[PDB]
Design a protein around this ligand. Structure first.
Ligand SMILES: O=P(O)(O)O[C@H]1[C@@H](OP(=O)(O)O)[C@@H](OP(=O)(O)O)[C@@H](OP(=O)(O)O)[C@@H](OP(=O)(O)O)[C@@H]1OP(=O)(O)O
Lengths: 1324, 154, 499
């Protein structure tokens, strides 16, 4: 019995920090069981109770125990023969037989003798020494122990027999369930966490019950490992049988606990048996809590009607629990707290937790006390902090049991428990951490409330320090708000708690009334309460709960007296509520808002308040189509307070709407005046949507430039920061006839922001020079060139050191140009892509298709030019010196020999494709031999010398969008190493710029042969940058973390631009090519198979049917490109479950936004080479989207068979739950956000597509004369109407169903995929 | 499977539904692999009532604590298994739990069922509402006012 | 040379004025505040030793001025705040104190606007701080997060970085045999070698675990080498006349053609660095230093036999350009680990923070030179090896490295090479040394250099004197005179441009 009683002492000896004791105890422990792997694994899984180890990471002892079985006397060695350093004499073995047969002093002999003695000393080294030292290092290091166990247990498992494996798995299943592990719960890592991670790697797999997996995930910080294991089990079982039921139950519970609302919603949409459940989930997922509540009620009525016929199976009970839980949640979001408190107090069906959450909000403190007692007897551990906080609530606010002394300790306990809960959450912060991040504010506000109530005690009441503390806490509460992504329940918590304390202040300073005879303290409490009510109503309105907001705002009338500011804000919020309602209802809500405005007793309100009221009245009358009265209202509003930006903006919108139809120029001038007067402030984010209208209106200008004259007149007083984002559009206008009057505007912007203007103007000027040289193939400079030169001259005069530094930087960029090998390789790849496009155009006639004249001229240019201010002359001299190379001459000669178009059979397209592939492979072999980096000192003396003393130069792209503050990152260094990387199917130089903050910013120097395409790509990037702020401002988009990833691109010349690199980024084709290289197959094989099958079918005198294309895609998927390539890549790349989960979720949401943009904005197709995947974060960016303008008609087409890339490898990686839930929900949320009328996305689209249409006209149809104003306006309106049509179609969400689901089904559908270009890779 | 020998071997406020009791018994039997009397078969497999509480709460009508689950098992299921819980579960035919959900749906349905003078201030400002000024004139008035304010400041 | 005391002097001065009652000193101090905070921010942004960075962060956060005066300079304080939250326990407490002061005293919109550049890193530090084992630190962090309100959970544009594995190949591993199972397993060593190197690097490690780490590293190094060399075969190979008569191939080795290191090569470099560190640790020196010297001899012999003699590898053969085949790489690579990984470890030791490691690097270079001189017959023939071109490029690369200590290691390497190797070789490589030393002088301009610039100047003067010193009448061979004239031309060309 003594040895049984001393087990904790023995386990203390095993984990002792003193190595001698630990060694003796292990020696006793090692001999206690046989030297066999299976028996020792059985010991650690069944015989050793690990509870007495305590918080020790007892996996260390498992490692020590199992390694002891290894043979110790064997000489140390490895299977990694390719990594071993070879022998000195190994050169003999590598040599041929002739040299070996031919091969067959004192200092050297002594050296070789001493070395032989050394090598003999090493040959004596045994594996046991490494094993023992390894075990000791595992004792000292927990990270090493965890890694070694995760690596080692699968390997031990593999060398077991099948019988041993089955027995060990059957014993492992209860081991994970053992109570002894409960002490590990707060260990970081848990030993059981590491054990479960090791098991997941085992092949064959070890089955674990879904409920056990969920318990381990929530208990031992195994959240995402358990989630991914349950997902895998679900997909293996085909997503019903009780096993599938329990798998989906555990997976849904994990999604709910992880606050993964979209994943849970998708799972239940597939799982649910009642269509009302899916409809309610779709409604609730997007904030339609009233409709979701109605749907849950209809579902409950249907279920009750079915219960009268027969009982309910236990398979449907999770759906009923879902209905109850989400109906309660919807009631919480709809501010129905009284009904919930009543519902929780229902006899026989009491819910003390619901009452405890609800009763305090409606001042039912008796129910709060009862619920607190019931919860305290039996409470979940995660809810402990909330119980302490509610006990503090009762201690402060209960009418009889006020105890303010307990609040400090209750706050400390709540904070400690919340921190404890935080450490049990995943290390990557996500939606699961939001409740605790809200709890932080809740707890500190509990403490601040305790301070206020201590101030209101009769001893402290009226004292100066108490008043000062009260005022300080009230102001701090006023400024400290939650965010729009927060559920309305959290806003309710914060505001109702604050309301209790504001009412306490009011009661205290109204009852006493001895001090403060002017009632300023009571007025302070009343004003705070009214402001909190108005803020709550405003947040309800912003989240779409307009009826809830109107109900909340109606509680202001309960207060006897309110300050006029709060009454003004209440009326303003009501008016905005009616405007929002009229957006979908129409005339009646406008009439109600007009009635509210008319009932307003203006006489108390100030001039600014009256002006705002009349502006709201003008908006309402404009929606009613009472144009004359609306104009009266706007005029009176602006005359009342001529600074009110909103009055000017709304009057401008009204006048622009009239101008677009009637087209009298004076209305255009009035609209431009209004818009420009609205922009006369530094808040650039507000004014951005107005300057877009101003720029769009210039398309309606006459031959006399009336609108440009108005812009020139009124634009004075508009700070240049407003124009920073527009600068591309400003330059587009500058090239036109209106540039004469807009020169002053651009000159002022260049004066204040020289770096922002300089590179665009430099690029535009050099583009104009190139176009002029092409036109007259010295020439007098055109008017746009003169204007650009004037702007640059003014900038050189005002900022000579800055512009001299920028010019020096750009002049250095010439050395970054690629060598001739890389240029010829790039041109071969581009020509191959063009040949593929032609081949798909000529798919009808494979084996008969001929090359187009464009491809003929391209190859002729390649063979004619085979790849080959002082910096430019020296570069030309270096280029000439390279031509001397005889190898280059031989390659040029044989290249010209292969690409001679006079030989028979060379004009065929597919023979050209094969020749291109051969030569691409040859040059890829030759390119790999080139140096991978070069030092800036070798050629770029200015960059190496450059420092902050040279000029205050900002890192490129800082002015693409005006940063809200002047915290611009300036350039401190150019790092001496420039790297050469293969990206975008071109050889690119990566420049590293060190910033004054010390961070290293990577930039790629890129060479583009085509100017217009680069401008179009930058145009799309600018549109994406402009759209991003809208996503930041709406719920449903902010809570899903939706944002476009737009890398900084700055053009420094027509051919060269600086891009903002992520060195951890790969393209999807690069992943595919890596998989093919590992598999040994060529990556272009599927395209060859596709065209060979087409030729085979066509040779039989028939066209390929849809079934033939389906069969081709099926063959490619079965043989060459399996569905699981991307998934297997992700599994290898992110072995940590949390990293895999985060990457996959970010990938899903970014792909949702990219596909939405591709479909709604009629962009060109997303090739897998365009899709850049950031391994370090999961963010996706596209290099590069362009508008799909039809060259023959200038209107948008984008009528491809699929709406976006949802190709089978992507679908497999996302999983069906990821496609259904987060992808669809993110697309719907983005569509609904961009369709909001207040954002005015149509104006930004008009001002971007105006530049796009001008570019198309210059490219196809053509002081050069501007294109016809009517043609430009019509084309832009048609393109914007098409975009907004697709946008509104996706935004429509009537009935809980969205066209986005059909769009996703079409994208995934194999029928549509098989009809795509093979170069698109419809299998990848 | 026989575990290897070690050096330490000595050589309730809401009523419980039958579905909850059945989940409790099945959790203890299947997951913990313990016998009726919770006698330890393998030293490493000590009873874990937190896991059982998690299992029970997956289908329970109210949160059951681990202590409550242990007390219920020891004080009801052991004496009952020594009609058995399986027999009662089979005979109930999910009627009681269905009626529970019917009652909840009825309570939720009950809760759901239980649910001029304006010209005077313009005339004081000097605004002729019935004769709108175009934006050009209002901008001119703003400029004149700003110029007069600047002159007064100077 | 030793700037630490100037910063301790600044800390003492700040702690003096920090008494608050010294208003006259506050007023006098305010004009200093912009330039001081700018300089301190630039210092803390740089690469320094841990104690130096801690001092810079503390100086940034404890400037003895009222917060109202900091308002225009608040953006300078954000990066030190993030550094403090990621620093030691005292630094984390100080950063939390400064952040709580800013939250309590400033308006939320203004403070949020200034946090926005750091904000991703600041919020990640705050979230991590919740997991800090100190209850005071975690509680203060939770209080600060609650005071931020909704700003704590606002979407980060710069998302959290994920640990991604870029390499498909498994790392090096040891073979363990389980006789009972009649099977063998591979036990992976990369993490073990990293842990051993961390143990040998840290000063807090117990001598027992330092010895264990040394044993792990030694056993791994023995396992990853062939050991198949035979005394008689080795002597027969190295005594071949080609090693002393045939012209050494004029082949250049450059890391510019090296792809990214394989896991095997990285683990080799770490293990060799740990071996050198054991050779310098006093308790491990008696066993590590002989082993390290003999292992350097082994690697040098492998390199010599591959690079020249009767059986030189095809990539070293005459007329061969630098290529990836000289290095262990995933795609083309060398057959087995290349012996050049020894030079990378020597460079790591030279560039290491603790300069005492430079001595073992010089010992290693001396051993390489002596073995090459014995095998090839002369010092002049020894320096013609491509391995010495790799040595020059890898050691001068440290001068380009950002840290002052890496630069200083490069300078010390240049000084050792110019002192030991023959004059003809020093003249051939004089321009590379000149460029490296000039870059050392240029890049540390305006930064805290712990004598690196002075050492670079002395090294440059000594190099110029040695190469420019006119040859005696007995030493005036045609080759040395021509080499000296060419080197003098190139060096004077470079110097005149710097004027
Ligand atoms: O929710 P909305 O009705 O669309 O208007 C809100 C907000 O209004 P509330 O504070 O009344 O909710 C503000 O509008 P104004 O008070 O300026 O009239 C303004 O935020 P600021 O306080 O910073 O001006 C912002 O508009 P903007 O994006 O132009 O800043 C914003 O409108 P959004 O919903 O479009 O953001």
């Amino acid at each position: 019995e003594l040895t049984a009683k001393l087990e904790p002492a023995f386990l203390s000896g095993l984990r002792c920090a003193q190595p001698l004791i630990r060694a003796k105890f292990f020696e006793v422990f090692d001999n206690s069981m046989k030297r066999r792997v299976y028996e020792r694994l059985l010991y650690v899984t069944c015989s050793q109770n690990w509870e007495a180890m305590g918080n020790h990471f007892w996996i260390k002892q498992c490692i020590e125990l199992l390694l002891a079985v290894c043979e110790k006397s064997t000489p140390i060695g490895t299977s990694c023969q390719g990594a071993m350093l070879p022998s000195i004499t190994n050169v003999i073995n590598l040599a041929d037989s002739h040299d070996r047969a031919a091969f067959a002093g004192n200092q050297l002999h002594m050296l070789t003798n001493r070395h032989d003695k050394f090598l003999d000393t090493l040959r004596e080294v045994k594996t046991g020494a490494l094993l023992s030292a390894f075990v000791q290092l595992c004792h000292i290091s927990t990270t090493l122990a965890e890694k070694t166990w995760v690596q080692l247990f699968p390997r031990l498992w593999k060398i077991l027999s099948d019988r041993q494996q089955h027995a060990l798995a059957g014993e492992i299943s209860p081991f994970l369930c053992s109570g002894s592990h409960q002490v590990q719960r707060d260990c970081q890592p848990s030993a059981l966490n590491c054990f479960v991670e090791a098991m997941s790697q085992c092949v064959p797999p070890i089955p674990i019950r879904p409920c056990v997996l969920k318990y381990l995930g929530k208990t031992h910080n195994l959240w995402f490992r358990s989630t991914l294991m349950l997902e895998h089990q679900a997909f293996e079982k085909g997503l019903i049988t009780p096993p599938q039921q329990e798998i989906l139950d555990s997976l849904a519970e994990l999604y709910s606990l992880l606050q993964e609302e979209d994943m849970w919603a998708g799972l239940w949409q597939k799982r649910c048996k009642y269509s009302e459940t899916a409809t309610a989930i779709a409604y609730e997922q997007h904030g339609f809590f009233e409709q979701a509540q109605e749907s849950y009620e209809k579902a409950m009525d249907k279920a009750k009607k079915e219960h009268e016929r027969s009982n309910a199976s236990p398979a449907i009970f999770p759906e009923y629990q879902l209905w109850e839980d989400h109906w309660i949640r919807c009631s919480k979001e709809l501010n129905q707290w009284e009904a919930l408190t009543e519902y929780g107090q229902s006899k026989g069906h009491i819910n003390p937790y619901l009452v405890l959450e609800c009763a305090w909000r409606v001042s039912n403190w008796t129910a709060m006390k009862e619920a607190l007692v019931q919860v305290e007897v039996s409470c979940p551990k995660e809810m402990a902090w909330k119980v302490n906080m509610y006990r503090g609530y009762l201690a402060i606010c209960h009418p009889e049991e006020q105890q303010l002394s307990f609040i400090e300790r209750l706050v400390e306990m709540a904070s400690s428990l919340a921190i404890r809960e935080w450490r049990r959450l995943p290390h990557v912060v996500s939606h699961v951490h939001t409740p605790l991040l809200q709890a932080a504010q809740q707890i500190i506000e509990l403490q601040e409330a305790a301070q206020i109530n201590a101030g209101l005690q009769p001893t402290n009441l009226g004292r100066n320090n108490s008043l000062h503390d009260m005022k300080t806490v009230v102001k701090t509460w006023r400024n400290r708000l939650p965010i729009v992504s927060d559920d309305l329940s959290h806003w309710s918590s914060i505001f109702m708690w604050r309301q209790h304390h504001y009412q306490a202040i009011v009661t205290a300073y109204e009852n006493s009334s001895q001090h403060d005879p002017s009632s300023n303290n009571a007025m302070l409490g009343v004003h705070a309460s009214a402001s909190a009510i108005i803020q709550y109503g405003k947040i309800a309105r912003k989240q779409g709960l307009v009826n809830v907001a109107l109900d909340i705002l109606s509680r202001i009338h309960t207060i006897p007296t309110v300050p006029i500011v709060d009454c003004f804000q209440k009326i303003r919020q009501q008016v905005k509520c009616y405007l929002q309602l009229a957006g979908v209802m129409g005339k009646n809500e406008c009439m109600q808002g007009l009635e509210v405005i008319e009932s307003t007793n203006l006489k108390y309100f100030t001039k600014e308040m009256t002006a705002e009221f009349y502006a709201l009245k003008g908006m309402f009358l404009a929606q009613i189509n009472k144009s004359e009265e609306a104009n009266k209202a706007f005029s009176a509003a602006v005359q009342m307070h001529d600074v009110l930006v909103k009055a000017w903006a709304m009057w401008g919108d009204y006048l622009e709407n009239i101008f677009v139809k009637e087209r009298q120029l004076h209305l255009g001038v009035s609209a431009i005046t209004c818009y420009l007067h609205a922009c006369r402030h530094q808040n650039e984010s507000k004014s951005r949507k107005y300057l877009a209208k101003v720029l769009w209106l210039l398309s309606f200008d006459d031959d006399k430039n009336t609108l440009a004259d108005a812009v020139d007149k009124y634009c004075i007083g508009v700070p240049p920061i407003q124009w920073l984002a527009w600068i591309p559009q400003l330059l587009t206008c500058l090239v036109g006839s209106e540039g004469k009057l807009l020169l002053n505007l651009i000159s002022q912007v260049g004066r204040v922001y020289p770096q922002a203007v300089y590179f665009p103007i430099r690029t535009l000027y050099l583009t104009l020079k190139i176009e002029q040289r092409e036109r007259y193939k010295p020439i007098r400079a055109t008017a746009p060139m003169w204007r650009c030169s004037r702007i640059m001259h003014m900038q050189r005069e005002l900022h000579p050191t800055l512009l001299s530094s920028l010019e020096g930087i750009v002049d250095q960029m010439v050395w970054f140009r690629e060598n001739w090998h890389e240029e010829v390789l790039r041109q071969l790849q581009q020509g191959l892509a063009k040949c593929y496009s032609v081949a798909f155009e000529k798919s009808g006639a494979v084996s008969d298709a001929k090359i187009t004249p464009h491809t003929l001229n391209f190859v002729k240019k390649l063979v004619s030019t085979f790849g080959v201010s002082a910096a430019s002359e020296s570069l030309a001299r270096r280029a000439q010196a390279t031509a001397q190379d005889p190898v280059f001459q031989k390659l040029k000669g044989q290249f010209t020999t292969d690409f001679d178009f006079s030989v028979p059979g060379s004009m065929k397209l597919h023979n050209l494709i094969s020749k291109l592939k051969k030569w691409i492979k040859i040059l890829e072999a030759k390119t790999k031999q080139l140096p991978k980096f070069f030092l800036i000192e070798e050629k770029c003396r200015f960059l190496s010398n450059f420092s902050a003393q040279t000029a205050e130069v900002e890192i490129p792209g800082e002015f693409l969008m005006p940063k809200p503050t002047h915290y611009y990152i300036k350039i401190a260094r150019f790092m001496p190493r420039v790297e050469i990387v293969q990206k975008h199917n071109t050889a690119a130089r990566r420049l590293y710029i060190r910033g004054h903050n010390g961070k290293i910013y990577p930039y790629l120097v890129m060479n583009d042969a085509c100017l217009t395409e680069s401008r179009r790509e930058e145009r799309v990037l600018q549109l994406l940058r402009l759209l991003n702020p809208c996503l930041e401002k709406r719920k449903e988009t902010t809570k899903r973390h939706l944002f476009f990833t737009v890398p900084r691109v700055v053009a420094v010349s027509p051919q060269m631009r600086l891009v903002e690199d992520n060195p951890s980024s790969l393209s999807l084709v690069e992943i595919y090519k890596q998989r093919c290289a590992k598999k040994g197959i060529e990556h272009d094989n599927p395209i060859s198979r596709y065209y060979d099958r087409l030729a085979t079918v066509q040779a039989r005198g028939t066209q390929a049917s849809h079934q033939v294309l389906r069969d081709i895609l099926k063959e490619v998927q079965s043989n060459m490109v399996p569905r699981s390539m991307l998934k297997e890549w992700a599994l290898h790349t992110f072995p940590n479950a949390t990293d895999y989960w985060t990457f996959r979720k970010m990938f899903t949401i970014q792909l949702a936004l990219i596909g939405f943009a591709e479909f709604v904005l009629h962009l060109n197709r997303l090739n897998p080479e365009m899709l850049q995947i950031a391994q370090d974060t999961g963010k996706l960016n596209v290099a590069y989207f362009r508008f799909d303008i039809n060259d023959a008609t200038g209107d948008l087409d984008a009528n491809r068979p699929v709406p976006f890339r949802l190709t089978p490898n992507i679908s497999e990686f996302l999983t069906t739950i990821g496609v259904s839930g987060p992808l669809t929900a993110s697309m719907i949320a983005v569509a609904r956000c961009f369709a909001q009328p207040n954002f005015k996305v149509d104006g930004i689209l008009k001002t971007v597509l105006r530049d796009e249409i001008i570019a198309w006209h210059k490219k196809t149809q053509e002081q050069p004369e501007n294109m016809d104003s009517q043609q430009l306006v019509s084309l832009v309106q048609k393109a914007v109407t098409a975009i907004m049509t697709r946008l509104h179609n996706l935004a429509q969400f009537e009935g809980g169903e969205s066209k986005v689901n059909t769009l996703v089904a079409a994208a995934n559908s194999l029928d549509n995929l098989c009809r795509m270009d093979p170069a698109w890779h419809p299998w990848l | 499977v026989v575990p290897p020998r070690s050096l330490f071997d000595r050589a309730d406020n809401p009523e419980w539904l039958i579905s909850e009791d059945w989940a409790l018994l099945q959790a203890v039997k299947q997951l913990l692999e313990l016998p009726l009397n919770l006698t330890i078969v393998s030293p490493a497999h000590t009873p874990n009532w937190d896991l059982v509480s998690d299992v029970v709460n997956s289908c329970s009508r109210i949160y059951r604590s681990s202590k409550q689950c242990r007390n219920r098992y020891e004080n009801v299921i052991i004496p009952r298994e020594e009609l058995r819980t399986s027999q009662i579960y089979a005979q109930d035919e999910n009627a009681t739990h269905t009626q529970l959900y019917t009652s909840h749906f009825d309570l939720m349905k009950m809760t759901a069922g239980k649910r001029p003078k304006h010209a005077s201030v313009l005339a004081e400002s000097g605004i002729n509402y019935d004769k709108p000024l175009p934006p050009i004139q209002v901008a001119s008035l703003r400029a004149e006012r700003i110029a007069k304010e600047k002159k007064a400041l100077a | 040379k030793e700037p630490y005391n100037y910063f301790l002097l600044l800390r003492a001065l700040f702690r003096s004025i920090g008494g608050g009652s010294h208003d006259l000193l506050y007023q006098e101090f305010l004009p200093l505040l912009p330039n001081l905070l700018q300089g301190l921010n630039m210092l803390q942004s740089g690469l320094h030793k841990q104690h130096m960075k801690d001092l810079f962060v503390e100086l940034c956060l404890t400037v003895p001025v009222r917060l109202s005066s900091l308002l225009p300079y608040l953006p300078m304080l954000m990066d030190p705040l993030v550094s403090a939250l990621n620093g030691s326990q005292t630094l984390v407490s100080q950063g939390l104190r400064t952040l709580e002061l800013c939250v309590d005293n400033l308006q939320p919109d203004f403070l949020y606007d200034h946090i926005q550049p750091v904000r991703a890193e600041l919020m990640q530090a705050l979230w991590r701080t919740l997991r800090n084992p100190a209850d005071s630190i975690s509680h203060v962090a939770y209080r600060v997060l609650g005071k931020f309100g909704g700003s704590n959970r606002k979407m980060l544009k710069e998302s959290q970085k994920l640990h991604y594995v870029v390499t498909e190949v498994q790392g090096p591993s040891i073979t363990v045999e389980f006789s009972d199972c009649k099977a063998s397993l591979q036990l992976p060593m990369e993490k073990a070698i990293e842990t051993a190197l961390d143990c040998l690097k840290s000063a807090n490690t117990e001598p027992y675990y330092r010895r264990q780490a040394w044993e792990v590293i030694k056993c791994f190094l023995v396992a990853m080498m062939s050991l198949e060399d035979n005394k008689h075969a080795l002597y027969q190979l190295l005594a071949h006349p080609n090693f002393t008569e045939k012209t050494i191939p004029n082949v250049i080795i450059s890391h510019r053609y090296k792809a990214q290191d394989t896991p095997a090569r990285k683990t080799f470099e770490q293990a060799l660095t740990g071996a050198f560190m054991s050779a310098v640790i006093k308790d491990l020196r008696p066993s590590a230093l002989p082993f390290v010297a003999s292992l350097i001899r082994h690697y040098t012999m492998v390199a010599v036999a591959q690079q020249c003699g009767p059986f030189l590898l095809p990539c070293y053969q005459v007329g061969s350009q630098p290529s990836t085949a000289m290095f262990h790489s995933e795609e083309n690579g060398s057959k087995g680990m290349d012996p050049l990984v020894l030079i990378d470890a020597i460079a790591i030791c030279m560039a290491y923070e603790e300069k005492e490691l430079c001595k073992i690097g010089e010992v290693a270079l001396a051993v390489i030179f002596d073995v090459a001189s014995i095998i090839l017959g002369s010092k002049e023939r020894a320096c013609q090896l491509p391995l010495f071109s790799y040595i020059v490029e890898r050691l001068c690369a440290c001068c380009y490295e950002q840290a002052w200590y890496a630069k200083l290691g490069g300078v010390v390497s240049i000084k050792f090479l110019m002192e030991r190797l023959p004059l003809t070789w020093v003249l051939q490589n004089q321009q590379t040394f000149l460029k490296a030393l000039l870059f050392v002088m240029m890049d540390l301009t305006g930064e805290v250099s712990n004598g690196a610039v002075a050492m670079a100047k002395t090294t440059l003067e000594q190099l110029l004197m040695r190469c420019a010193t006119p040859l005696k009448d007995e030493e005036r061979a045609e080759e040395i005179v021509a080499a000296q004239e060419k080197s003098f031309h190139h060096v004077t060309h470079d110097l005149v441009r710097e004027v």
